[PDB]
Amino acid sequence: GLEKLNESVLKVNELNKTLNIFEMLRIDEGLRLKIYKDTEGYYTIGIGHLLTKSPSLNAAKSELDKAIGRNTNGVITKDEAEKLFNQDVDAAVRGILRNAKLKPVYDSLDAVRRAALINMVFQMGETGVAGFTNSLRMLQQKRWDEAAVNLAKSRWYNQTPNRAKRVITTFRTGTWDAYGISLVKSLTF
Fold first, then answer.
1. Angle between helices 161-173 and 111-129 (to 10 degrees)
2. Alpha-carbon span 45 to 84, nearest angstrom
3. Buried b / exposed e along 28-64 (16+ C-beta atoms within 10 A)
4. How far, in Å, CA of 35 to CA of 5, rounded?
5. Separation CA 89–CA 49 (nearest Å)
6. Exposed (0-12), middle (13-18) or buried (19+): which is 107, by Cβ within 10 Å?
7. Active site residues
8. What are the positions of the active site (predicted)?
9. Contacts with 30 (C-beta within 8 Å, 6 or more apart), sequence order
């Protein structure tokens, strides 16, 4: 078994030679390189990048063409998907720091828990995340056990329990064991 493991890690290193919050939001939401519809019926692409809520069919293609600045038929690439993802993350974090209801907590936490908060914002919207006052206070005060005990009691918990559980363990340990290319490397490690 160990010999086969070394062989597989060598294969991994080779595939890498041939070739992060992005992987987290990929595992939770899901990535698509072609235009599809989300659970609410709106037009999304990439990772949660909402193209258009309008009933218009071609209203998503024009949004994409104006966003990435290219005349693609709706088939984007990997690096441009991550570029749109970083753009959306920048927008969400700007909204977070501007609202100020989340700014003290976000400034109190480290990078991992910041990415977890950004995941919550991407999922339910900054307005919905602002409705976790107790959890937010326990996060800025850096009481992790009680914060996870509290986050497990919400509509956000019953609705999507697995994603909530992963985000909650990420808040707890402050690591990437949950959600763990880079993944194959770390995990074979």
1. 140
2. 10
3. bbebeeebeeeeeeebbbbbbbebbeeeeeeebbebb
4. 38
5. 10
6. exposed
7. 29, 38
8. 29, 38
9. 47
